[PDB]
Design a protein around this ligand. Sequence first.
Ligand SMILES: [K+]
Ligand SMILES: [K+]
Ligand SMILES: [K+]
Ligand SMILES: [K+]
Ligand SMILES: [K+]
Ligand SMILES: [K+]
Ligand SMILES: [K+]
Ligand SMILES: [K+]
Ligand SMILES: [K+]
Ligand SMILES: [K+]
Ligand SMILES: [K+]
Ligand SMILES: [Mg+2]
Ligand SMILES: [Mg+2]
Ligand SMILES: [Mg+2]
Length: 1319
Amino acid sequence: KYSIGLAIGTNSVGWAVITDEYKVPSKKFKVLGNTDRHSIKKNLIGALLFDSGETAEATRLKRTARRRYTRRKNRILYLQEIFSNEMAKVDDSFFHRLEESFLVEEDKKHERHPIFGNIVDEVAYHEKYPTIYHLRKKLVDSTDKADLRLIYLALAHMIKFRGHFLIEGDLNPDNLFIQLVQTYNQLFEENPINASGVDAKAILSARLSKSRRLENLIAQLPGEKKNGLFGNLIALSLGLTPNFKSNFDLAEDAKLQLSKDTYDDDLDNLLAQIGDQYADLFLAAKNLSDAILLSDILRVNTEITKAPLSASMIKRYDEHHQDLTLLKALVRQQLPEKYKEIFFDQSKNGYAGYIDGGASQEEFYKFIKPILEKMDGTEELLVKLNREDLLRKQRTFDNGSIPHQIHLGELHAILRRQEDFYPFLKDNREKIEKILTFRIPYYVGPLARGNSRFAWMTRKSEETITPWNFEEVVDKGASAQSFIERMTNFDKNLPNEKVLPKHSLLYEYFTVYNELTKVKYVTEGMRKPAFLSGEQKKAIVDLLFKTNRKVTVKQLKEDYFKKIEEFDSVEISGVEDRFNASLGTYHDLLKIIKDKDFLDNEENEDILEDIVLTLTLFEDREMIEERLKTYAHLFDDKVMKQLKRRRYTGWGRLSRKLINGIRDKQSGKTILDFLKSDGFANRNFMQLIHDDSLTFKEDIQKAQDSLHEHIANLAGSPAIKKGILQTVKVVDELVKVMGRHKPENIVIEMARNSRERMKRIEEGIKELGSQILKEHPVENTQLQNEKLYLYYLQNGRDMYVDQELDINRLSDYDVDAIVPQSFLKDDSIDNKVLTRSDKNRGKSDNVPSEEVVKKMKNYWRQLLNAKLITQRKFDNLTKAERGGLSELDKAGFIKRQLVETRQITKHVAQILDSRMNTKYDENDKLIREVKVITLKSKLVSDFRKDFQFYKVREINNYHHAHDAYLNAVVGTALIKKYPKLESEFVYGKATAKYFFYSNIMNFFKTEITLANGEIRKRPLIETNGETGEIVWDKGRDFATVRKVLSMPQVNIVKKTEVQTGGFSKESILPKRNSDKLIARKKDWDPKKYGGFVSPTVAYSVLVVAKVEKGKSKKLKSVKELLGITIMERSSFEKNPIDFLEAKGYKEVKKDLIIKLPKYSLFELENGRKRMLASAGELQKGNELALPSKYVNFLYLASHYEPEDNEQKQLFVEQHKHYLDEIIEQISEFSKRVILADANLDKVLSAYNKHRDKPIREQAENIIHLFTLTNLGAPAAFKYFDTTIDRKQYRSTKEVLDATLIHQSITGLYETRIDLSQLG
RNA sequence: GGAAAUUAGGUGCGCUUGGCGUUUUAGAGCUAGAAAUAGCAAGUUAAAAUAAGGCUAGUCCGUUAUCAACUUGAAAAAGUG
DNA sequence: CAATCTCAGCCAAGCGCACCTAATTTCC
DNA sequence: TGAGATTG
Ligand SMILES: [K+]
Ligand SMILES: [K+]
Ligand SMILES: [K+]
Ligand SMILES: [K+]
Ligand SMILES: [K+]
Ligand SMILES: [K+]
Ligand SMILES: [K+]
Ligand SMILES: [K+]
Ligand SMILES: [K+]
Ligand SMILES: [K+]
Ligand SMILES: [K+]
Ligand SMILES: [Mg+2]
Ligand SMILES: [Mg+2]
Ligand SMILES: [Mg+2]
């Protein structure tokens, strides 16, 4: 008889076997191999450790980048093939010189000047066109016939770096304010605005923040304020999104943004409230928006050139030239000694490091700003620097905002200019434009032909896909439909039927009637509440749901029960405040098609389901239009135009066949039929499909993956999922260890941004319109501090008092839990706030008091509408106005502290239970031979603290194994003592439940001082009340637990793993002579071209062979560890002997080759162990088994800050000698297996310096000292403020004559190989 | 233990795109001097590569998951204390 | 050799589906 | 945290 405890973590599976006396057995296991040792004794406790499992995300991002480099290359190849025949007439090696431009002169086949093949023409080109943008602008604007090579380069530059696809439709740069002002002045005839003299271009296109230009513009309009109507508008032409609630005395918030696709509908929503007369106001706002949309990137008047982007780059270049000339002149006059540093030293962040070295524009500015402020005549240079507009390059990090339409306009213009001289440019103009503009639709995916596991695209024609034949060769419709249909759920009830669109009319009718049919009403004179009849539900749907998007309970009472039923008073149950379900799509389509009778006519149901399906399935408006054309004769062209813009996303949970297809045989009614009208029973969906007197249940019944696949397909981090599969393998091994007898119980416990924080605070303060970021700028790395993050999330105010907080006094402020942490175990931002003093929350018993909620609710709602708090956080803050925390709330919170509710942990329980329990009884009921028990970590955590079995994670890895053991002990004892708990813990009144779960663990204790101010005593022996069988003996089972935790032999196994992933570090380093550099392409010698460093070793191999020595090349026998790199691995595995001989080995002992992945384990002298870090470095291989008295002493001494504390304090003082004893434990261990005497000397030295320090601080820093002794990779650590750097073991030679240890997953089965016998 | 709806927040898998960076080459450096060097001039741009590569030859695929040893099997797998 | 110093690809956009958690109404 | 290079 035995049980298994398991502790499942992100990097470990702890495990232990226990008997019915809570003991861990030990056993002799066979030892295989070639050593002296035939067997060894092992305790049945241990922990498997592993590197974290990784998600597929990084791999996915690299796969996308590969496709985009492939396709970018093909864009150029398309362009060159078009130019091929005519370029051969001008210069038959021009494309060859382009392709070999990277090669050193000695390697080149053609002359080294790429464009023209000779130095005088090449020099003349750069003199006339210092940047590509000079050429582009020249070719756009000039009427001269141009050299075909210069045409090619300009078009290639645009196609290769073609700009983004975030703006739909066409752009035509044309560089209105007088009219809009005159418009507003007319539409508000009594309150006009005078805009005479206002330079609207200079104010709005200023480089400043949009929030600032609003101020500047309004400053020029006396009588207008920034929050006035015209002020709120200026942001619309600008690009912000403000709310016009107070402008029009509105009741609901209504904002608008021109670039959003919802603009025409929100403007329609707003105009319906404010009146059609306001059409010309937002219309003139939209007209002005066109000419100044691209003013951020186009800084040139579009009347003097058709290439304002290139002209803007040229303006960068010219100002750079002018300002560089000035900067050099000023420096020569005032600071000459700095000239050499600024303009020659590439290692400094001056101009030299900016141009030739590695200084970014940001690092260059910071370096040169104090030099500018120090000198005279640099006022204009300083303004440009602060505008981030000084000595600018033209290829820069901020060019991501250029839309492809801008590059397209210059491309089109060059083609128009030069097609007059080259007929092939006229015949291929649209082809070339297609190369720039064509984008593979994301709903089509990779253009594969049977060899891509990622692709779903299908072809209308079996031929090669180009940008010009894409629409004709690819079946866009089938591919877009496949895109969605491969992913969407089927109806679990009818598993061959796809779920309906979430926005289907039928689906929403289903939702509305399912909710409505369970409403009840009662009025004075009714004996009892009544369901609504079919006729009343139809009246409510027709009168309320089909006239209002949302239906409140007040409208139900006033507009139905008063108006129709003639009730003055009525009590409603089944719905609170408002119905959750609504007919959103009905009202959407009513606005569009303006034909209520059409919507209400049942004969149109198929048409309208197909329309919404098309609007849900497809995202492309032209594909939607194409698919809607069967219905074109039904609607006006104007309606059709609005319908194709009405997109929906999202899928329901149920199919059309289920909700309104299958019929009950006796009645002939569908499910929706019953929801509309079901006598006086009003059965809802759950009742209908479970009712044995209907045929829905049997028809749903008639309509109705390996382990690794199953685990992989679970929701939850790939990290925790790695531990789950290892857990199953640990259990399988332990069962085999136990003679294939199954355990009685298996007890399982499963363990429980900087950029994102800045984005939430930026987006949230922009929503509030607050200037807190301007007053108190922050860096994303700072927002990792809890109190500073809360400060900005609360707009610098107290959450419980209507007052600002002082940002420089956060150490005096409190972080309080909204729901007190004594009830719920939430320490996240969603349950914490920053307040001056937590006493102002109200009482500590509950949620923040009612008075606080009354005062702060409106301020809390503004944070909620800014997403600075979540809805969950708001509901907990305002809970007091809904009764606060009730008695059931408290019981549930204490229950949830005990009973695991996570689905992922239930999945682990289910997996183990279905692997252990496989037999059925006489009633075909499952036979539960093994009870799978799930515990939360708090149970064992409190057990450890209550009975002084303390845990110090930094000492070694044993705490994972000790956890699993205590899980087994506490879990089996718990259900032995209270077998009724099995419903709660085994897979397969309010105050009383509160008191019960608060005291369920009392039976372990002898004397319990209850919270009720009383003390209770229990006997030495705890028993089950029904059976009398002994469960716990406080005179022997606690000592047994001590004998378990103090055992030094714990099977800790670091999972050996082949390394995978990137070939090497990614940086391309410049050329050097060191043979370390790796070629980036087959024929790119790193001595000429640079290359990569640091290949990653996939695994090492032991090689016993011979190598050639000296000029004589005489053969010498060697035994070596060879690191096989990731890049080499396929070639090595394809033919190991041929690979090894190419490396220089001869007469390899083929049968002696040993594959040695990372963490391969070796034992040397005196028990010292090492693991392979690679082929050239080792890791520490031992665990320091510190005695239990020292572990408990460290815990108590390090946590020095009931009246048992005085007893714990006295114990620390009486055992002050343990500190030196622990240092001697570390020293002996380190001298035996660590062998880092310089670091150890530095540690003993540092420990002697601080013997005068308080005991708590010494014990605190002693815990750090175990980094020297820990298993695994060496790592630096600190003792007080003396830093000990790491000692790496950068030689593997010694393991070549050591003992190699192959371990099974538990480490219980070993094969030991004495490598000294090899050679 | 489940289901539908509402509200909100997370996570995973997949697709399509934009901008940098880096590397080598091209962008005639000048004057003095035998040279070492010194005094100046100049600088903003481009091509090409962006896992080596692969066969299945596609505008495809190439970094996730999974892995002690031994044995009988090329392989999948199965067995061994 | 050792001890010590040094280094590490990054920033951004849009879209689809599927899960999970946590509160509310109604049910099985 | 493996490993390239420089300093001792
Ligand atoms: K040559
Ligand atoms: K004003
Ligand atoms: K550089
Ligand atoms: K630079
Ligand atoms: K560049
Ligand atoms: K409601
Ligand atoms: K859609
Ligand atoms: K029509
Ligand atoms: K892997
Ligand atoms: K990895
Ligand atoms: K292993
Ligand atoms: Mg790119
Ligand atoms: Mg390639
Ligand atoms: Mg570049």
